């Protein structure tokens, strides 16, 4: 009758959590890249491919936080800077009275601080939070440039990958293939605008947890690169102050302006039209506001570039109801929305101009206003098509057999 027969050699699998490598081409726990990655396509295969309950993202975020903190503990702790700071406003040039020349009685030195790193007190003024925050500075050797970092599976784990360019986040896609070493992933911190990343080719792609809910974010990679030509027009000067020598700003070179950005108005308006074409898929008008409030890091497009921390509100853009942005920078910063720890971002001399990409966008319904504020969502776009899988060659099935 219906009797069981074991069938060793089965090609089944059951996805599971695991630790992965940190393979790059150039951040010390890295290993070099594999020579000839093999992408073995699978024919006539389908499986419930999810991307929001993924187990690699939470791994990747844990890695970045560690990689961030590992290369930051040994530095000149800014604890000595906890003392009343004498300061005065700067009127050498105004073309914007934010900067403030601050003098300090020191084991008497002067420096320039932005308004966002000085707090109102009760005249003479003090830094934002040092008596109640263990500030730290960054070594000049390290560079905040985004280095590509691959994730490869260890022995026994086969990383699948979805291929259907029409991929609505979750749900099956019968185009999967074993991609043991993954494609280039760039860990870049950005809000409201995924700078560098992939882009749907056919058309704007809309993916989210569950669209009908207005809590879950909207993650979109639309079609094609829009650039963001944005600069820092200030020849600033760095001059060492030995306390173990934290960097500061002694003065600047002549003219002063604001870090204007350029967005190529025509291209940006063109892209949103395709975007709103898809947004209407699931007649009522769709209007992009520019977020609501809560934190520069979130409210604005707080994007690192050129070794400096930009905080630039998209109020300029996202003003449409159907360029040039005054992008101020802040010296102190608490990355990862943390409580307590905060960095210092030592200054860099001269000017810096940089432009790469606006490949992705983060939107929050009410589609309307943008705000991401959670760098876990950023990496859920690049890892949208990878789920580590453990092969299980055993198998069991009933059969009309009787053994003995």
């Amino acid at each position, epitope marked *: 009758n219906l009797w069981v027969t074991v069938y060793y050699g089965v090609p089944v699998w059951k996805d599971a959590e695991t630790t992965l490598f940190c393979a790059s081409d150039a951040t010390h726990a890295c290993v070099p890249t594999d020579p000839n990655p093999q992408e073995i396509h699978l024919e006539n295969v389908t499986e419930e491919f999810n991307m929001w309950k993924n187990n690699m993202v939470e791994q990747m*975020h*844990t890695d970045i*936080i560690s990689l961030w903190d590992q290369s930051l503990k040994p530095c000149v702790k800014l604890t000595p800077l906890c003392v009343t700071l004498q300061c005065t406003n700067v009127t050498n040039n105004i073309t914007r009275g934010e900067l403030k020349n601050c003098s300090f009685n020191m084991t008497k030195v002067y420096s320039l601080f932005y308004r966002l790193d000085v*707090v109102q007190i009760n005249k003479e003024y003090r830094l*934002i*939070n040092c008596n*109640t*925050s*263990a500030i730290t500075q960054a070594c000049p050797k390290v560079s905040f440039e985004p280095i590509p970092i691959h994730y490869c599976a260890p022995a026994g784990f086969a990383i699948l990958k979805c291929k259907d360019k029409k991929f609505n986040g979750t749900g099956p896609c019968p185009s999967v293939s074993t991609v043991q070493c993954t494609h280039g992933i760039k860990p870049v911190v950005s809000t409201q605008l995924l700078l560098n990343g992939s882009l749907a080719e056919e058309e704007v792609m809309i993916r989210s947890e569950n669209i009908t*809910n*207005n*809590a879950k974010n909207i993650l979109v990679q639309f079609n094609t690169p829009v650039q963001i030509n944005c600069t820092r027009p200030n020849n600033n000067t760095r001059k060492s102050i030995r306390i173990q020598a934290f960097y500061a700003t002694g003065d600047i070179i002549g003219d002063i302006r604001q870090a204007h950005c350029n967005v190529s108005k025509a291209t940006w308006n063109e892209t949103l039209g395709k975007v709103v074409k898809q947004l209407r898929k699931h007649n009522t008008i769709i209007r992009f506001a520019n977020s*609501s*409030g*809560g*934190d*520069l890091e*979130v*409210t604005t497009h707080s994007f690192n570039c050129g070794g400096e921390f930009f905080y630039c509100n998209t109020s300029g853009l996202f003003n449409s109801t159907w360029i040039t942005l005054p992008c101020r920078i802040k010296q102190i910063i*608490n990355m*990862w*929305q*943390r*409580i*307590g*720890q905060a960095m210092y971002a030592p200054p860099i001399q001269g000017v810096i101009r940089c432009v790469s990409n606006i490949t992705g966008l983060i939107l*929050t319904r*009410d589609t309307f206003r943008p705000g991401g*504020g*959670d760098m876990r969502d950023n990496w859920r776009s690049e890892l949208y098509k990878y789920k580590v899988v453990k092969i299980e060659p055993l198998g069991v099935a009933p059969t009309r057999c009787k053994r003995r």
Partner: T-cell receptor
Amino acid sequence: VQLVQSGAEVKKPGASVKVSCKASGFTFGRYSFTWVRQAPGQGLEWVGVIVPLVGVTNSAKKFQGRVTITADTNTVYMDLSSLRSEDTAVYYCARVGDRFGSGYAMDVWG
Amino acid sequence: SALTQPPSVSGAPGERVTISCSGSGSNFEYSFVYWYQQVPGMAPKLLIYDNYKRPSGVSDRFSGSRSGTSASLTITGLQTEDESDYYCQSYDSSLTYWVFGGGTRLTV
């Protein structure tokens, strides 16, 4: 996981109160703890915050130096000095932020 | 900072109640606002963090909203269970101080 908390007490004006919160099921790791209190029939009013990782403390600044919050490795201790009639309240403690240290929304409550 | 709530807002079951979160300060444009529910006599629980999100084990009926300097907590499908107090707070990241709202009592 839960925040087991000390029992009720009866103190005098200007006496010393020291309440406890023991991390049941988890270590300090990167979380931060805050202390809030509620006058009976009144809304919550903040009291303090500690970050066990880096020893950072704070207060509501209308407890001017009266309150100190300590972390021992397992539990957290906050002490009151110079009590007055307005300081009678239920003193909750809560965990701030998930793993990774992110967030500021205190959600697990004793 | 400081922020003030209406002291009590009431409504019949099945309605769409909106409890305002005023008191907006100059810095309140920054400083995310959360939302807390407490059953009177019980430990307050969390409802909304970072102005719109919702934790896993919280009913989908609640929802968040930010409007200019003010905030609002939106409820649909009101039931008899909603008889409790709702407090809204904001994390002033400058001076590192949570400040709580006065207290709103939702009465059926």
